[PDB]
Amino acid sequence: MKIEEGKLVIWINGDKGYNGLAEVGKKFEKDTGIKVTVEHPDKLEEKFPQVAATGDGPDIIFWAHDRFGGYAQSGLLAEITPDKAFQDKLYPFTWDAVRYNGKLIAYPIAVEALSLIYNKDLLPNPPKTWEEIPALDKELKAKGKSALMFNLQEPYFTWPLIAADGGYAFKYENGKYDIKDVGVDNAGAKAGLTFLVDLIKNKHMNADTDYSIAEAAFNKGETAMTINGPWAWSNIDTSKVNYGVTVLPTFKGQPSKPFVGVLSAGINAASPNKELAKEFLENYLLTDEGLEAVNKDKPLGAVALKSYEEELAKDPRIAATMENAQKGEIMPNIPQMSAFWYAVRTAVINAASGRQTVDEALKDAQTNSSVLYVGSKTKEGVVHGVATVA
Ligand SMILES: OC[C@H]1O[C@H](O[C@H]2[C@H](O)[C@@H](O)[C@@H](O)O[C@@H]2CO)[C@H](O)[C@@H](O)[C@@H]1O
Numbered sequence: 001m002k003i004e005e006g007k008l009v010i011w012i013n014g015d016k017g018y019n020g021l022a023e024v025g026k027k028f029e030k031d032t033g034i035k036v037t038v039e040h041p042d043k044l045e046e047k048f049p050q051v052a053a054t055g056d057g058p059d060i061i062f063w064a065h066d067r068f069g070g071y072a073q074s075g076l077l078a079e080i081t082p083d084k085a086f087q088d089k090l091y092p093f094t095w096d097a098v099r100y101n102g103k104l105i106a107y108p109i110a111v112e113a114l115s116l117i118y119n120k121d122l123l124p125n126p127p128k129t130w131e132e133i134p135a136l137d138k139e140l141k142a143k144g145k146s147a148l149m150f151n152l153q154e155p156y157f158t159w160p161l162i163a164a165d166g167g168y169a170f171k172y173e174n175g176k177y178d179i180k181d182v183g184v185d186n187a188g189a190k191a192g193l194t195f196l197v198d199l200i201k202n203k204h205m206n207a208d209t210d211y212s213i214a215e216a217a218f219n220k221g222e223t224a225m226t227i228n229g230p231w232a233w234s235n236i237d238t239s240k241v242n243y244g245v246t247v248l249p250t251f252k253g254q255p256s257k258p259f260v261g262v263l264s265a266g267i268n269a270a271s272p273n274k275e276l277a278k279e280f281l282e283n284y285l286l287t288d289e290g291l292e293a294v295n296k297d298k299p300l301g302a303v304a305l306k307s308y309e310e311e312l313a314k315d316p317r318i319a320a321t322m323e324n325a326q327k328g329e330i331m332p333n334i335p336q337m338s339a340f341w342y343a344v345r346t347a348v349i350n351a352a353s354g355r356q357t358v359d360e361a362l363k364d365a366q367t368n369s370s371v372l373y374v375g376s377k378t379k380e381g382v383v384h385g386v387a388t389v390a
Contacts, residue, residue, distance in 0.1 A: 001055075001270075001272055002054070002055050003056060003057065003059060003268065003270055003271050003272060005272040005273060006273070006276075007036070007037065007273070007276075008025070008028075008034060008035070008036045008059045008060060008277060008280060009036075009037050009057075009058040009059050010025065010037070010039070010058055010059065010060040010061075011038075011040070011041060011044055011047075011048060011060070011061050011062065012039075012040055012044075012062035013040060013044050013062065013063065014042070014044075015231045015232070015298070016040075016231050016294075016298050016300075017231070017293075017294040017295065017296075017297030017298035017300070018038050018040050018297070019297045020293040020294040020295070020296055020297030021038050021285075021293075021294050022036070022038040023293045023297075024036075024280075024284050024285055024290045024293050024294065025037070025280075027284060028279075028280050032279075034276055034280075036280065044061075044063065045063055045067050048061045048071070048076075049070070049071060049076055049372070049373040049378065050373075050378050052076040052268055052269070052270060052373070053074065053076065053373045053374060053375050053377075053378040053379075054375055054378070054379070055270040056270065057270070058268060059267065059271040059273045059276070059277050060265055060266070060267055060268070060271075060277050060281070061265070061266050061268065062109070062263060062264070062265050063264065063266075064112065064261030064263055064264065064331065065097040065098050065106065065108070065261060065262040065263075065264045065331065066259075066261060066331035066332065066333055066337045067333075067337065067338065068098060068100065068105055068106050068264060068266055068333050069100045069105070069333040069335050069337065070334075070335040070337060070338050070373070071105075072100050072103075072105045073100075073335045073371050073372065074335075074371045074372050074374065075269055075371070076266075076268065076269055076373060077105050077106065077266045077267065078266075078267040078271065078274050078277075079103065079105075080104055080106065080107065080266075080267060080278070081278065082104065082107070082278075082282065086282055087104075089286065089305060089307065090286070090304040090305060090306065091304055091306060093111075094111065094262050094304035095108060097262035097264070097330065097333065098262065098264050098333070099333075100333055100334075105266065106265055106266040106267075107265045107282075107286065108262045108263075108264050108304040109263040109265060109285075109286070109300065109303070109304055110230075110262070110291075110300035110301045110302060110303045110304055111260065111261075111262055111263075111302040111303075111325060112229050112230060112231075112261045112262070112263060112300075112321075113229065113258045113260045113261075113301070113322075113324045114156070114157065114160060114227055114228065114229050114248065114258040114324060115229070115245045115246060115247070115248065115317075115320045115321055115323075116225060116245070116247065116248045116249065117218065117225065117226045117228055117232070117236065117243055117244070117245050117246075118224060118226075118243065118246065119218070119221060119224050119225070119242065119243060120242045120243065120244050121221075122140070122145060122221070122224040123136075126224075126225065126244065126246055127225075127249050128249060128250060129249050129250050129253075130161065130195060130249045130251045130256075132249075133147050133148055133199065133204065133249070134199065134202060134204055136224070137204040140224055145221075145222060145223065145224060146204070146217075146222065146223045146224070147204065147223065147224050147225060148199075148204070148223060148224070148225045148226070148227075149205065149209055149213070149214040149218060149222075149223040149226055150209070150226050150227035150228065151209065151210055151211040151214055151227075151228075152200075152205065152208075152209050152210070152348070152349075153209075153210045153345075153349065154211070154345070155341060155344040155347075155348045156259065157227055157228075158193075158348050159257075159258065159259050159344070160227075160248055160256035160257055160258040160259075160324075160328065161193075161195065161196060161251055161256055162184075162188075162189050162193055162196075162344075162348075163188070163189075163257035163259075163329070164192055164250070164251035164252065164254050164256045164257055165187070165188035165189075165191045165192055165251055166183070166186055166187060166188020166191075167183055167184060167186060167188045167189030167192055168182075168184075168186075168188075168189075168329075169182065169184070169259075169329075169331075169337075169369070170182060170183075170334070170336065171183065177332050177336075179334070179336045179370060180370050181370070182340070182366055182369045182370045184340075184343070184347070184362055184365045184366045184369055185359075185362040185365065189362055190358055190359065190362060191252065193347070193348065193351055193358045194358050195251065196348075196351075196352065197351050197358055200352055207349075207352040207353045207354075214226050214228075215228070215232065215235065218236070219235055219238075219241060221240065221241055227248070229301065230298075230299040230300060230301040230317070230318070230321055231298040231299060231300075232298075233245070233298075233299050233317060234297065234298045245316070245317040245320040245321070246320050247320065247323050247324060247327070248324055248327075256324075256327065257327055257328040257329060258324050258325070258327070258328040259328060259329060259330075259331045260325045260328050260329065260330045260331060261331055263300065263301070265281055265285070286304070286305055287305070288305070288307055288308050288309075288310070291305055291308050292308075292310050295310070299317070301318070301321055302318055302321065302322060302325075335371070335372055336369070338372060339368060339369055340369045342368070343365040343366075343368035343369040344365050344369070346361070346364065346365060346368070347361040347362050347364065347365035348361075
């Protein structure tokens, strides 16, 4: 087989606590002799389905739940078999996130949402509104700093602002998402993206800023604010910055609405190690000690495991995560999410760079948002012979 029998290969995004996860893997190996190798490939959410479609890849894939319906529909995921006693250990909300066509398709790990992160020494009183950011930036620029830097390459980070005044992905009614009813080019979405583009045109932000650039600037103390998730807190702890984590600014008086993700672990349908993967996930990772090892590396957010309590008091950063999560919406897990995200990525990048107007960018994204992975689609070469055209 392509996937090696008798070991586990696990893929997780490079922003998460892969070192802590590897520690859990080493404990599994110490107890059972089964080697666990953790990797963090680039473009994971795309690499996984490409390799899994050919029966290759990791035994276990970690990503937010929104990608998993597409993976399931394409036959890339094993059926998971947690018993009732195991299911009882995790919050019902988190199982809901990984339920697709009635089946649980992955193990939920933790709830993630973006928050506003700010430097208390530069900015003891962070802005309550998006609208006050230009004036704040002007003052900071005179002091050799800037107001705000965050990743402008992934639409996840701009979505909270696009959604604030009325943008939405897929309409949800009567227990169903309507894939023909998209909210990407409505008045609310246009208002939010226009605000973002104005920030860039007015030199308060730079369209080229990505995750690494924003993190480096915030953690060096060059910018007063950033927008990020729980995984980012570890590096800020290491930094010299005295930081707060708080509610995102409002726009037109309405809350920013981050899309809430549940980090989840799926088992590759091609894996010959499905029972090993179940043992590892249920009995090693989704335990107080397992989650602690990952969380101590990079924070997970609000974990799915009911029993977990490694602190004496609440973590105010988690409280802020939850406040933002409650203001936002849970991502759909439907297969159409990949098309939505590709479309909105294009719109934000093109509007931010000036390649298109906001109206044109969102018009296209609306059209483009409204099975995914099979060998004969995902293979990089041709599958028919040239002779066929004769
Ligand atoms: O930007 C589109 C992207 O958004 C989400 O990905 C997040 C992920 O959920 C977070 O955990 C964070 O760590 O990384 C990503 C942002 O760069 C969706 O989950 C993903 O499918 C989508 O492509």
